[PDB]
Design an enzyme around this catalytic site. Structure first.
Site, PDB file in Angstrom:
ATOM      1  N   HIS A   1     -12.675   1.524   4.569  1.00  0.00           N
ATOM      2  CA  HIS A   1     -13.438   2.663   4.066  1.00  0.00           C
ATOM      3  C   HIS A   1     -13.711   2.583   2.566  1.00  0.00           C
ATOM      4  O   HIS A   1     -14.482   3.375   2.029  1.00  0.00           O
ATOM      5  CB  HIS A   1     -12.760   3.999   4.430  1.00  0.00           C
ATOM      6  CG  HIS A   1     -11.617   4.382   3.541  1.00  0.00           C
ATOM      7  ND1 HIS A   1     -10.299   4.198   3.900  1.00  0.00           N
ATOM      8  CD2 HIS A   1     -11.595   4.967   2.320  1.00  0.00           C
ATOM      9  CE1 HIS A   1      -9.515   4.656   2.941  1.00  0.00           C
ATOM     10  NE2 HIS A   1     -10.277   5.128   1.970  1.00  0.00           N
TER      11      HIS A   1
ATOM     12  N   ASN B   1      -3.244  -0.947 -17.584  1.00  0.00           N
ATOM     13  CA  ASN B   1      -3.860   0.237 -18.164  1.00  0.00           C
ATOM     14  C   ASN B   1      -5.368   0.090 -17.988  1.00  0.00           C
ATOM     15  O   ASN B   1      -5.989  -0.780 -18.598  1.00  0.00           O
ATOM     16  CB  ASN B   1      -3.521   0.368 -19.650  1.00  0.00           C
ATOM     17  CG  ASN B   1      -3.951   1.707 -20.224  1.00  0.00           C
ATOM     18  OD1 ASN B   1      -5.100   2.131 -20.056  1.00  0.00           O
ATOM     19  ND2 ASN B   1      -3.031   2.382 -20.900  1.00  0.00           N
TER      20      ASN B   1
ATOM     21  N   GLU C   1      -5.489  -9.236 -18.037  1.00  0.00           N
ATOM     22  CA  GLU C   1      -6.510  -9.078 -17.009  1.00  0.00           C
ATOM     23  C   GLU C   1      -7.410 -10.285 -16.752  1.00  0.00           C
ATOM     24  O   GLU C   1      -7.619 -11.132 -17.623  1.00  0.00           O
ATOM     25  CB  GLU C   1      -7.402  -7.878 -17.340  1.00  0.00           C
ATOM     26  CG  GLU C   1      -6.639  -6.608 -17.681  1.00  0.00           C
ATOM     27  CD  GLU C   1      -6.350  -6.465 -19.171  1.00  0.00           C
ATOM     28  OE1 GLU C   1      -6.035  -7.480 -19.829  1.00  0.00           O
ATOM     29  OE2 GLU C   1      -6.430  -5.329 -19.678  1.00  0.00           O
TER      30      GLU C   1
ATOM     31  N   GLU D   1      -3.915  -6.223 -13.987  1.00  0.00           N
ATOM     32  CA  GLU D   1      -4.215  -4.955 -14.635  1.00  0.00           C
ATOM     33  C   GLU D   1      -3.012  -4.016 -14.731  1.00  0.00           C
ATOM     34  O   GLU D   1      -2.098  -4.071 -13.906  1.00  0.00           O
ATOM     35  CB  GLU D   1      -5.358  -4.266 -13.878  1.00  0.00           C
ATOM     36  CG  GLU D   1      -5.834  -2.951 -14.474  1.00  0.00           C
ATOM     37  CD  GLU D   1      -6.445  -3.124 -15.854  1.00  0.00           C
ATOM     38  OE1 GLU D   1      -5.726  -3.574 -16.766  1.00  0.00           O
ATOM     39  OE2 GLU D   1      -7.642  -2.812 -16.025  1.00  0.00           O
TER      40      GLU D   1
ATOM     41  N   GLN E   1      -7.420   0.311 -21.394  1.00  0.00           N
ATOM     42  CA  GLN E   1      -7.058  -0.500 -22.548  1.00  0.00           C
ATOM     43  C   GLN E   1      -6.905  -1.965 -22.200  1.00  0.00           C
ATOM     44  O   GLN E   1      -6.628  -2.314 -21.056  1.00  0.00           O
ATOM     45  CB  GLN E   1      -5.746  -0.008 -23.164  1.00  0.00           C
ATOM     46  CG  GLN E   1      -5.786   1.411 -23.692  1.00  0.00           C
ATOM     47  CD  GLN E   1      -4.472   1.817 -24.334  1.00  0.00           C
ATOM     48  OE1 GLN E   1      -4.286   2.972 -24.724  1.00  0.00           O
ATOM     49  NE2 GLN E   1      -3.553   0.863 -24.451  1.00  0.00           N
TER      50      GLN E   1
ATOM     51  N   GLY F   1      -7.984   7.305  -4.487  1.00  0.00           N
ATOM     52  CA  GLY F   1      -7.906   6.299  -5.532  1.00  0.00           C
ATOM     53  C   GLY F   1      -6.838   5.262  -5.227  1.00  0.00           C
ATOM     54  O   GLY F   1      -6.858   4.166  -5.783  1.00  0.00           O
TER      55      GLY F   1
ATOM     56  N   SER G   1      -6.226   4.441  -2.001  1.00  0.00           N
ATOM     57  CA  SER G   1      -6.728   3.823  -0.777  1.00  0.00           C
ATOM     58  C   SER G   1      -6.904   2.326  -0.913  1.00  0.00           C
ATOM     59  O   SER G   1      -7.337   1.834  -1.952  1.00  0.00           O
ATOM     60  CB  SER G   1      -8.073   4.441  -0.373  1.00  0.00           C
ATOM     61  OG  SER G   1      -7.926   5.796   0.001  1.00  0.00           O
ATOM     62  N   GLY G   2      -6.560   1.610   0.152  1.00  0.00           N
ATOM     63  CA  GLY G   2      -6.691   0.167   0.161  1.00  0.00           C
ATOM     64  C   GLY G   2      -5.525  -0.541  -0.490  1.00  0.00           C
ATOM     65  O   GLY G   2      -5.347  -1.749  -0.308  1.00  0.00           O
TER      66      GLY G   2
ATOM     67  N   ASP H   1      -8.671   0.362   9.814  1.00  0.00           N
ATOM     68  CA  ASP H   1      -9.092   0.551   8.432  1.00  0.00           C
ATOM     69  C   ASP H   1      -8.584  -0.594   7.563  1.00  0.00           C
ATOM     70  O   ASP H   1      -7.601  -0.451   6.838  1.00  0.00           O
ATOM     71  CB  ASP H   1      -8.563   1.888   7.902  1.00  0.00           C
ATOM     72  CG  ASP H   1      -9.237   2.313   6.612  1.00  0.00           C
ATOM     73  OD1 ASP H   1     -10.179   1.618   6.171  1.00  0.00           O
ATOM     74  OD2 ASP H   1      -8.830   3.349   6.045  1.00  0.00           O
TER      75      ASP H   1
HETATM   76 CA   LIG Z   1      -6.185  -3.064 -18.952  1.00  0.00          CA
END
Ligand SMILES: [Ca+2]
Length: 240
Positions: free
Chosen positions: A45, A61, A69, A59, A64, A186, A188-189, A93
């Protein structure tokens, strides 16, 4: 994550942020798990809409530069063939994303460990949910990665009338429900990390919560049970 706490910087190295392009900017929409250098596991979904997606590994933050990353595009989206957008309670799902390039593995980027097919956890097993999702029902996204202790609730109990009833199926995993901690929009997944044999493995993919709210007593967060899709996952990664 509601009722969570900030996770140690990059202590869940397989966690990824799935973002989509909005005009000239990018926005976080879901979580995911890096299972291969060029494969991500997330919720179906989360990729129902036809938008431009990108994956961010290492990741911590979202607003920032953490200096860890790696940003990479999504070149292929494989949703489970039985997924039905109008019946999330029907299950299935789950989706696999092939990345445009292979990310570099290091202290901050690692592959998530998957359980063996058919593995079912005993009631109240120790697990942790992680994500940048809403910290309150109808609230806002978290800036830094959050985690919350969320023990499992076995199928027999979760599917009882005092909880989710028939809305939950055996192809799902339930965790939490203490009315204080839970997943939320947020998340989800994203993964549900459970301790098994001294090692943390991803046993769930965050799927849904109650319409009444994120943290509701006797309404555990519902996850797609990863151990029921091992053959499917292997078959997809072996072909494409
Ligand atoms: Ca960051």
């Amino acid at each position: 994550v509601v009722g969570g706490t900030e996770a140690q910087r990059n202590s869940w190295p397989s966690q990824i942020s799935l973002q989509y392009r909005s005009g000239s900017s990018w926005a976080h929409t879901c979580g995911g798990t890096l299972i291969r250098q060029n494969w991500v596991m997330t919720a179906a979904h989360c990729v129902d809409r036809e938008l431009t997606f990108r994956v961010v590994v290492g990741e911590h933050n979202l607003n920032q530069n953490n200096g860890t990353e790696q940003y990479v595009g999504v070149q292929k989206i494989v949703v489970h063939p039985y997924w039905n957008t109008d019946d999330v309670a029907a299950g299935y799902d789950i989706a696999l994303l092939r990345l445009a390039q292979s990310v570099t593995l290091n202290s901050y980027v690692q592959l998530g460990v998957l359980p063996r097919a058919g593995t079912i956890l005993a009631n109240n097993s120790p697990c942790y949910i992680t994500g940048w999702g809403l910290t309150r029902t109808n609230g806002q996204l978290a800036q830094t990665l959050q985690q919350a202790y969320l023990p499992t609730v076995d199928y027999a109990i979760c599917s009882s009338s005092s909880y989710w009833g028939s809305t939950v199926k055996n192809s799902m995993v339930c965790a939490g429900g203490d009315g204080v901690r839970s997943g939320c929009q947020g998340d989800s997944g994203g993964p549900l990390h459970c301790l098994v044999n001294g090692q943390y493995a991803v046993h769930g993919v965050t799927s849904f919560v109650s319409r009444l709210g994120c943290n509701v007593t006797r309404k555990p967060t519902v996850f797609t049970r990863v151990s029921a899709y091992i053959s499917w996952i292997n078959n997809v990664i072996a072909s494409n």
